[PDB]
Write a protein that binds this ligand. Structure first.
Ligand SMILES: Nc1nc2c(ncn2[C@H]2C[C@H](O)[C@@H](COP(=O)(O)OP(=O)(O)OP(=O)(O)O)O2)c(=O)[nH]1
Ligand SMILES: [Mg+2]
Lengths: 406, 553
DNA sequence: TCGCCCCCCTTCGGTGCTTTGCACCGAAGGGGGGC
């Protein structure tokens, strides 16, 4: 095969990101995976005269309890040329979110049959660490299309189409969408019939080289307003401050005849009767929150952003938008491992679930705004990561003013 | 000998050329020290004479070696280093003796003239041009280039380490039950073989090294405990740090205090309970390393405590993989924490401390979590797993924290240990307003142009106040309005502010702060019995809020 | 009058916010230790 010429974006250099500490069992898995990859010529040992580096770690899904190497090429991908400019990009089918069951397949191994541009290989270097620094780090670089690299689905695309054409010809009603190393494959068949045709797709692949999602239950959680029989002063300034904030999202929401039902310097526990002109304003605003916002449309030219708030008792609310206060989607994530007591595991799982929904719906992951300290996240998140991709994120400390989303 | 290993190709950064900087004068003792090293380096092929076709130069000097007799030739390649390509460093960290396992047979070996046994990429050699002065002016100095890795070049450590890793790899593959700790050119070699077979393997490793050009002189060849290694002393059963000598002065400069603190941090890895907060504060706001700084009373006490700790003998033990790792933390006051990592009681693997102040406003629970995270990261590095924790915080204190705090947080498997002072929340804010308690509507505003401001409140019991403020900010005024409401109210209070900023700080239940104003608010929160704190948006004419907003105008 | 690595404590300056200071964070100064 002949390799495709690949370049970084103009004026950018390759990634230079330090390896973080790894547990003993992740290091041993990496050593065995990399040693085997090197025998097969997919990677070559390199030295320190290559100045680039990308962190490496390993994950182990339990209902496939062998280790998966994960290189965090997020930096390299940001600096790699766009294949939209080269017109090699994958299109996203609008029908996948309509299916009732979507199974995720890890097809990352297909990339290892295509060589990588020799002049680009140096940018893919990574370093395996050493328990108690017994040795210097051991460095490798890729000779073939790496897993997790933006360029690999783009370069492999026409090969991927030829591999899949017989299956989607034979199944015109099943929708398959490639996102990086993954295939998202959706259908409307009965749950055991869906799984049967997944196994058929797997073995048509094995001849060349997860669990079930349901788009059908991803409820949107709207802004709700409390329902009571009697209303305190505090209940009403908690309601007014919440609607004043929603007035940036929705249209024509007023608080003028509830604003000064609080007339005067009154006690917070003093019960105020609702006027007929406040019950009028309350239910009108209550409906405006029942029906979705008009004028919000996805724009594939712009990035997606996700915000998450911790609500307690395992509940996590989230919004996905591209422009502030124009939410394409609002939601609520809840889990019950039964241990009941790990915030970081819950947030890490919430991030994978939300990112998965964006892939299914729009074909890319959002940049997350995470309600956690950077160092708390970085101490633990890899212990709970199960996806072959990693989204972009940043860390925010935003105290709740309103409890808008609950 | 020069290794027959392949050179590593190295480049200058693009557009850059080589260094052209003149040699400086040096003493006769160092000139003849270098002439002896240089004329013998030429005979061993380490350097080669060069002439004027080579336009580059870089100055050279010499320093003493810990074996006092020997000299170390060193070149001031700071200019060449700037112009040399970047490297990815393969030395990721420092091996620690607490990560060693007990071994029946131990050897420590060191390679002679290590850097000089690794050849340098041939196309690069011309940029290493230097000159040996020889009394400076009776002659224009003799000029050489390096054929091997120079001491002082930015690339030499990584290229040596990488090369040493390649040379060792055949021996490690053939000998998986022999542990070789490889730090630069220093090799710790441990095995569970009887001394006779162990020495056989050592001779075999030494012969393997010599066929790749790496001598192992007998001087640097340790075979009997205690082994001197990485600044420690390795016994069969235990390890110690090599003696730590603290500076003792009548007058202390900034630079002296800096060295003292550094010595203490180094000691903290095995001496439990070291503290450096009061000595470190003496460095704040100083402007010269030779400035004299008088020890405060608190720093003298801290120093005296550290000295009493340092007079007692201590030792670490080695790692037993078949037993759990346990990490125990104690609170020391003023954001200082100390910890011990052990497997069996009263036999520490190592100790340490955490005393960083992160953020302007924080609390003990947050800092405990930071300590936990530091220890967790260090244990992954040293042992490849995280330990079980013993922490001086009640399970109910923790559960109260991670439910009312809006950020995700977590501590791994841990057990409560009753070692006062315990970590606790110093106050809580009521989730619901409090019946019968006064209701304050607070507000503050300042003028950004004139830094003049006002803070005040109104009250459902009809109480109102307004205080003028000079040299303030918008955010300070709002903190002040809350300050006054807490000041003028009983043990139970309901407060209403329109400052998201102020609510954000107080809602995180801080117990300490870099700001004296926030410090004062914290002290008042701690003295209260119940406080409910509520927010409403500004400038929308909301009852109570609008009235105090009007009054502060 | 040098190099590379890890650690801690202090200081400085860039970033982004529906800001006008403020809090966050990475880098660089000093120190310890290793070869
Ligand atoms: N640039 C520089 N490199 C050093 C220094 N100290 C040690 N190294 C590097 C270069 C040395 O070759 C290597 C091994 O340290 P050694 O003290 O064992 O020196 P070396 O092996 O060259 O001579 P030796 O025969 O062991 O006395 O580590 C130093 O102070 N400056
Ligand atoms: Mg040596």
């Amino acid at each position: 095969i002949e390799t495709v010429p690949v370049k970084l974006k103009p004026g950018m250099d390759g990634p230079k990101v330090k390896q973080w500490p790894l547990t003993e069992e992740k290091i041993k898995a990496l050593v065995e995976i990399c040693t085997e990859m090197e025998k097969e010529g997919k990677i070559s040992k390199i030295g320190p005269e290559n100045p680039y580096n990308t962190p490496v770690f390993a994950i182990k899904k339990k209902d496939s309890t062998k280790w998966r190497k994960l290189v965090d090429f997020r930096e390299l991908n940001k600096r790699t040329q766009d294949f939209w400019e080269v017109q090699l990009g994958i299109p996203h089918p609008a029908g996948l979110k309509q299916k009732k069951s979507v199974t995720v397949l890890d097809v990352g191994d297909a990339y290892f049959s295509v060589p990588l541009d020799k002049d680009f290989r140096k940018y893919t270097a990574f370093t395996i660490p050493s328990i108690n620094n017994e040795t210097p780090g051991i460095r490798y670089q890729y000779n073939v299309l790496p897993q997790g690299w933006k360029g690999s689905p783009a370069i492999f695309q026409s090969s991927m189409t030829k591999i899949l054409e017989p299956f989607r010809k034979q199944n015109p009603d099943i929708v398959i969408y490639q996102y990086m190393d993954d295939l998202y494959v959706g259908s409307d068949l009965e749950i055991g019939q869906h799984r049967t045709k997944i196994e058929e797709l797997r073995q048509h692949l094995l001849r060349w080289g997860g669990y079930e999602l349901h788009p059908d239950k991803w409820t949107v959680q709207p802004i709700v307003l409390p329902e009571k029989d009697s209303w305190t002063v505090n209940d009403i300034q908690k309601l007014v401050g919440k609607l004043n904030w929603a007035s940036q999202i929705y249209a024509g929401i007023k608080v003028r005849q509830l604003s000064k039902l609080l007339r005067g310097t009154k006690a917070l526990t003093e019960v105020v009767p609702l006027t007929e002109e406040a019950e009028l304003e309350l239910a009108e605003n209550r409906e405006i929150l029942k029906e979705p916002v008009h004028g919000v449309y996805y724009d594939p030219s712009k990035d997606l952003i996700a915000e998450i708030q911790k609500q307690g008792q395992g509940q996590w609310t989230y919004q996905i938008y591209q422009e502030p206060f124009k939410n394409l989607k609002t939601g609520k994530y809840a889990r019950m491992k039964g241990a009941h007591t790990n915030d970081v595991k819950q947030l890490t799982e919430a991030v994978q679930k939300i990112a998965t929904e964006s892939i299914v719906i729009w074909g890319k992951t959002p940049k997350f705004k995470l309600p956690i300290q950077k160092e708390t996240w970085e101490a633990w998140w890899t212990e709970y990561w199960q996806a072959t991709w990693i989204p972009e994120w940043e860390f925010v400390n935003t105290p709740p003013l309103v409890k808008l989303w609950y | 000998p020069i290794s027959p290993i392949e050179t590593v190709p190295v480049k200058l950064k693009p557009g850059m050329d080589g260094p052209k900087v003149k040699q400086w004068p040096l003493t006769e003792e160092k000139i003849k020290a270098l002439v002896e090293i240089c004329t013998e380096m030429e005979k061993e092929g380490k350097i080669s004479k060069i002439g004027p076709e080579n336009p580059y130069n870089t100055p050279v000097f010499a320093i003493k070696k810990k074996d006092s007799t020997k000299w170390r030739k060193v070149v001031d390649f700071r200019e060449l280093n700037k112009r040399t390509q970047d490297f990815w460093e393969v030395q990721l960290g420092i091996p620690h003796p607490a990560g060693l396992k007990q071994k029946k047979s131990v050897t420590v070996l060191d390679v002679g003239d290590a850097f000089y046994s690794v050849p340098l990429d041939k196309d690069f050699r011309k940029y290493t041009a230097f000159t040996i002065p020889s009394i400076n002016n009776e002659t224009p100095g003799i000029r050489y280039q390096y054929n091997v890795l120079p001491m002082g070049w930015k690339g030499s450590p990584a290229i040596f380490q990488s090369s040493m890793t390649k040379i060792l790899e055949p021996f490690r593959k053939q000998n998986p039950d022999i542990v070789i700790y490889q730090y630069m050119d220093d090799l710790y070699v441990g095995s569970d073989l009887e001394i006779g077979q162990h020495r056989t393997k050592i001779e075999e490793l030494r012969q393997h090294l010599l066929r790749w050009g790496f001598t192992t002189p007998d001087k640097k060849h340790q075979k009997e405990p205690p082994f001197l290694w990485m600044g420690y002393e390795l016994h069969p059963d235990k390890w110690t740090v090599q003696p730590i000598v603290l500076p003792e002065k009548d007058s202390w400069t900034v630079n002296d205090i800096q060295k003292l603190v550094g010595k203490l941090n180094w000691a903290s890895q095995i001496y439990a309970g070291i503290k450096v907060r009061q000595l470190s504060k003496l460095l704040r706001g100083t402007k010269a390393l030779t400035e004299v700084v008088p020890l405060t009373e608190e720093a003298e006490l801290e120093l005296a405590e550290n000295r009493e700790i340092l007079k007692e003998p201590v030792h670490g033990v080695y790692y037993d993989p078949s037993k759990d790792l346990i990490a125990e933390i104690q609170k020391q006051g003023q954001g200082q924490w100390t910890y011990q990592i052990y497997q069996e009681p009263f036999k520490n693997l190592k100790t340490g401390k955490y005393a960083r102040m992160k953020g302007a406003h924080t609390n003990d629970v947050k800092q405990l979590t930071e300590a936990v995270q530091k220890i967790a990261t260090e244990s992954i590095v040293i042992w490849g797993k995280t330990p079980k924790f013993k922490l001086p915080i009640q399970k109910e204190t923790w559960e109260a924290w991670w439910t009312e705090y809006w950020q995700a947080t977590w501590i791994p498997e841990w057990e409560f240990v009753n070692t006062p002072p315990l970590v606790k929340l110093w106050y809580q804010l009521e989730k619901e307003p409090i019946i019968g308690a006064e209701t304050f509507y607070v507000d503050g505003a300042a003028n950004r142009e004139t830094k003049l401001g006002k803070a005040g409140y109104v009250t459902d019991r009809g109480r109102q106040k307004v205080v003028p403020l000079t040299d303030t900010t918008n955010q300070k005024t709002e903190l002040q309005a809350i300050h006054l409401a807490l000041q003028d109210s009983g043990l139970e209070v309901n407060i209403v502010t329109d400052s998201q900023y102020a609510l954000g700080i107080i809602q995180a239940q801080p117990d300490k702060s870099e700001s004296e104003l926030v410090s004062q608010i914290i002290e008042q929160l701690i003295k209260k019995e119940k406080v409910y704190l509520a927010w409403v948006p500004a400038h929308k004419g909301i009852g109570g809020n609008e009235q105090v907003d009007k009054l502060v105008s």
